Amino acid sequence: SMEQVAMELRLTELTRLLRSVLDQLQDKDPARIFAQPVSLKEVPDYLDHIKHPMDFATMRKRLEAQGYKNLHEFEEDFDLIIDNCMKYNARDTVFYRAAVRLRDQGGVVLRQARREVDSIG
């Protein structure tokens, strides 16, 4: 149908916007601490601690399959990256600290994204 196509154009444009959002968030991680999944070869107990691992490469795969229906779903995954880190790692670690700074800097990007998503529909 013509509607299904209209819908698909909306999702494509959301994917376009979320791709730019993801790039902006990932720039706030210059150390690349959150770029890839925590290695289960190197942290073999990880899944005993963290039940839903997340990282920026995994988000990108979902994004490019148009697997984010709305900004809320995308934010859920970003928040997992941060919250997983802040639980696994102690406060006095470079990893925890990196997550705090990513959360703080990301907030600004995500604030305007929400306005853009509501604004453009």
Side-chain angles (χ1 to χ4, degrees), residues 11-12 15 19 58-60 62-68:
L11 179 61
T12 294
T15 303
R19 187 179 308 108
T58 302
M59 290 189 64
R60 198 170 292 280
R62 183 165 165 192
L63 177 64
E64 289 314 334
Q66 300 186 349
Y68 292 116

Short mmCIF file of all heavy atoms in Angstrom, two decimals, residues 11-12 15 19 58-69, unseen atoms left out:
data_model
loop_
_atom_site.label_atom_id
_atom_site.label_comp_id
_atom_site.label_asym_id
_atom_site.label_seq_id
_atom_site.Cartn_x
_atom_site.Cartn_y
_atom_site.Cartn_z
N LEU A 11 10.14 5.68 9.14
CA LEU A 11 11.18 4.85 9.76
C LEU A 11 12.58 5.10 9.18
O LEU A 11 13.57 5.14 9.94
CB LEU A 11 10.81 3.38 9.69
CG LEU A 11 11.81 2.38 10.29
CD1 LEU A 11 11.98 2.68 11.80
CD2 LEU A 11 11.34 0.95 10.15
N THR A 12 12.68 5.30 7.87
CA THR A 12 13.93 5.55 7.25
C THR A 12 14.47 6.86 7.70
O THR A 12 15.70 7.05 7.85
CB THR A 12 13.86 5.49 5.66
OG1 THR A 12 13.55 4.16 5.26
CG2 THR A 12 15.17 5.91 5.02
N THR A 15 15.64 6.51 11.26
CA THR A 15 16.92 5.82 11.21
C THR A 15 18.01 6.78 10.85
O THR A 15 19.12 6.73 11.44
CB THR A 15 16.83 4.61 10.27
OG1 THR A 15 15.81 3.77 10.71
CG2 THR A 15 18.10 3.80 10.22
N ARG A 19 20.90 7.69 13.38
CA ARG A 19 22.28 7.48 12.99
C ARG A 19 23.14 8.67 13.33
O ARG A 19 24.26 8.49 13.77
CB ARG A 19 22.38 7.16 11.48
CG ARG A 19 23.78 6.76 11.04
CD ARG A 19 23.86 6.43 9.54
NE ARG A 19 22.87 5.44 9.07
CZ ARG A 19 21.80 5.70 8.30
NH1 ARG A 19 21.53 6.95 7.88
NH2 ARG A 19 20.98 4.71 7.95
N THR A 58 26.81 -2.94 18.65
CA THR A 58 25.57 -3.72 18.71
C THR A 58 24.42 -2.77 18.38
O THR A 58 23.51 -3.14 17.62
CB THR A 58 25.44 -4.48 20.01
OG1 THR A 58 26.58 -5.34 20.18
CG2 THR A 58 24.16 -5.31 20.11
N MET A 59 24.46 -1.54 18.88
CA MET A 59 23.36 -0.57 18.57
C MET A 59 23.35 -0.24 17.09
O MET A 59 22.30 -0.10 16.47
CB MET A 59 23.55 0.73 19.36
CG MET A 59 23.30 0.60 20.87
SD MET A 59 23.26 2.16 21.77
CE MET A 59 21.81 2.96 21.04
N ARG A 60 24.53 -0.11 16.52
CA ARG A 60 24.63 0.22 15.12
C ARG A 60 24.04 -0.89 14.23
O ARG A 60 23.45 -0.62 13.20
CB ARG A 60 26.07 0.57 14.77
CG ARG A 60 26.19 1.35 13.45
CD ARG A 60 27.64 1.85 13.32
NE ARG A 60 28.04 2.88 14.29
CZ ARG A 60 27.77 4.19 14.22
NH1 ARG A 60 27.04 4.68 13.22
NH2 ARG A 60 28.23 5.03 15.15
N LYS A 61 24.24 -2.13 14.61
CA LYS A 61 23.70 -3.26 13.82
C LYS A 61 22.17 -3.16 13.85
O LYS A 61 21.51 -3.25 12.82
CB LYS A 61 24.16 -4.61 14.36
N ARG A 62 21.62 -2.92 15.03
CA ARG A 62 20.17 -2.77 15.14
C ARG A 62 19.67 -1.56 14.35
O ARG A 62 18.68 -1.66 13.60
CB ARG A 62 19.76 -2.74 16.57
CG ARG A 62 18.29 -2.66 16.75
CD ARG A 62 17.89 -3.00 18.17
NE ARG A 62 16.49 -2.57 18.41
CZ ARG A 62 15.89 -2.50 19.58
NH1 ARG A 62 16.51 -2.78 20.72
NH2 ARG A 62 14.62 -2.08 19.63
N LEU A 63 20.35 -0.47 14.48
CA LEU A 63 19.96 0.72 13.77
C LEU A 63 19.88 0.47 12.25
O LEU A 63 18.91 0.84 11.60
CB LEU A 63 21.00 1.79 14.03
CG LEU A 63 20.84 3.11 13.32
CD1 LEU A 63 19.57 3.76 13.80
CD2 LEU A 63 22.01 4.04 13.52
N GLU A 64 20.90 -0.17 11.70
CA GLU A 64 20.99 -0.35 10.24
C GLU A 64 20.04 -1.38 9.68
O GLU A 64 19.74 -1.33 8.48
CB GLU A 64 22.42 -0.68 9.84
CG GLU A 64 23.39 0.47 9.96
CD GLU A 64 22.94 1.83 9.40
OE1 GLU A 64 22.09 1.86 8.48
OE2 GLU A 64 23.48 2.88 9.85
N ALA A 65 19.54 -2.28 10.52
CA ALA A 65 18.42 -3.11 10.20
C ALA A 65 17.08 -2.36 10.43
O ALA A 65 16.04 -3.02 10.55
CB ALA A 65 18.42 -4.35 11.10
N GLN A 66 17.12 -1.02 10.61
CA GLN A 66 15.91 -0.29 11.07
C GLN A 66 15.14 -0.93 12.23
O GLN A 66 13.89 -0.98 12.22
CB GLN A 66 14.96 -0.06 9.84
CG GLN A 66 15.67 0.76 8.78
CD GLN A 66 14.76 1.14 7.62
OE1 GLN A 66 13.66 0.63 7.51
NE2 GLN A 66 15.19 2.10 6.83
N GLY A 67 15.87 -1.38 13.26
CA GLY A 67 15.30 -2.07 14.34
C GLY A 67 14.91 -1.19 15.54
O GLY A 67 14.42 -1.71 16.53
N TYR A 68 15.09 0.14 15.42
CA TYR A 68 14.56 1.06 16.44
C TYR A 68 13.24 1.69 15.92
O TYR A 68 13.28 2.49 15.04
CB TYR A 68 15.58 2.12 16.82
CG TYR A 68 16.82 1.54 17.59
CD1 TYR A 68 18.08 1.60 17.04
CD2 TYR A 68 16.70 0.96 18.84
CE1 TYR A 68 19.20 1.08 17.70
CE2 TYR A 68 17.82 0.41 19.51
CZ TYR A 68 19.04 0.50 18.94
OH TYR A 68 20.14 -0.04 19.59
N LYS A 69 12.17 1.37 16.58
CA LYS A 69 10.82 1.91 16.18
C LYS A 69 10.58 3.35 16.59
O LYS A 69 9.83 4.08 15.93
CB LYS A 69 9.71 1.03 16.73
#
